[PDB]
Amino acid sequence: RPGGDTIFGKIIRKEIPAKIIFEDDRCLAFHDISPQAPTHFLVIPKKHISQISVAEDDDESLLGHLMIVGKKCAADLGLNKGYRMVVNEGSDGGQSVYHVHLHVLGGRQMHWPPG
Amino acid sequence: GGDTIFGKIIRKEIPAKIIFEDDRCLAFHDISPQAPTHFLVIPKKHISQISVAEDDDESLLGHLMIVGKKCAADLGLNKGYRMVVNEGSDGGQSVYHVHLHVLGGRQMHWPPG
Ligand SMILES: Nc1nc2c(ncn2[C@@H]2O[C@H](COC(=O)NCCc3c[nH]c4ccccc34)[C@@H](O)[C@H]2O)c2nccn12
């Protein structure tokens, strides 16, 4: 079982269903099961990285790819007025799944501060 | 890099509390902090907004995140932190120069705005 047994690892291997937006060799974009905005999806690497605080230097282009795929998916989903991208690290950041992931939220006015 | 206040900061024309600099990005404390630690990591290249980032900019964007997580560690954020990129009016984007927010030193809540 390449990629581990977090919920996200299982989604990657099609063991747990998800509503997929986009998939390539590096990443997967899918809707969040508990959306906090009219549109709320995740972009995750297929490579399992537990949390951004332990990402390797060589993980740079992968992390970038999450954001590029995120912004392309937002455009394809018609988030013309904009959106917010969030990565949470650890307890104070509010991480509940220990597989790196990029939240993309839009379809309403997002407020400040961002939690 | 650019016709925004962040361009002035990169060019050292106005003061900012600089945390880290290299040949392609700058990290500095936010003047309007929303948490006990709240800094920005910005590219020196003037990309106005994430929505217009080019494919070739992928590893530069990733670099902002790696620099952010290294700065966060250096600033003592061992209990965690939140990274944010705002796009456009719904995203609450305040400056049209791509910037990664890094916030910590308190419990960050949900939703993220
Ligand atoms: N599609 C889909 N999505 C899922 C599934 N299981 C989990 N997720 C989503 O993963 C995200 C992880 O977010 C965080 O790790 N921190 C953000 C939220 C958070 C958790 N604890 C906190 C504590 C403080 C502040 C924020 C938070 C959440 O938004 C979940 O709704 C799932 N199973 C089948 C399909 N599934």
Provide the token pair at B57.
């900019």
Provide the token pair at A35.
């959306």
B-contacting residues of A 16-55, CB under 8 Å? 36-37, 52-53, 55
* Domain edges within chain A: 1-115
Q: What Cα–Cα distance (Å) separates residue A99 from each residue in A42, A87, B18, B52, B73?
A: 11, 11, 31, 27, 19
Whether chain A has a CB inside 8 Å of the CB on B70: the answer is no
CA nearest B55: which of A23, A46, A68? A68
Sheet architecture: strand order including B81-87: A20-23, A27-31, A39-45, A102-106, A83-89, B81-87, B100-104, B37-43, B25-29, B18-21
Contact call for residues A21 and A79 (beta carbons, < 8 A): no
CA nearest B4: which of B32, B45, B59? B45
What span, in angstroms and rounded, lies between the C-alpha atoms of B74 and B92? 28
Neighbours of A14 (CB within 10 A): 9
3-state secondary structure of A31: strand
Q: Is B110 in the pocket of ligand 1 (CB under 6 A)?
A: yes
Strand-pair category, A102-106 with A83-89: antiparallel
DSSP state for residue A100 in the 8-state scheme = -
HEC per residue, chain B: CCCCHHHHHHCCCCCCCEEEECCCEEEEECCCCCCCEEEEEEECCCCCCHHHCCHHHHHHHHHHHHHHHHHHHHCCCCCCEEEEEEEHHHHCCCCCCCCEEEEECCCCCCCCC
- Annotated catalytic residue, options B46, B63, B99, B109: B99
Contact call for residues A15 and A28 (beta carbons, < 8 A): no
Please give the annotated binding residues of B for AMP, written as ranges. Answer: 30-31, 86, 92-94, 99-101
* Residues of A whose CB is below 8 A from B33: none
| Residue A40, strand partner residues | A105
Method: X-ray
B30, B60, B65, B75, best to mutate vs chain A, most A CBs in 10 Å: B65
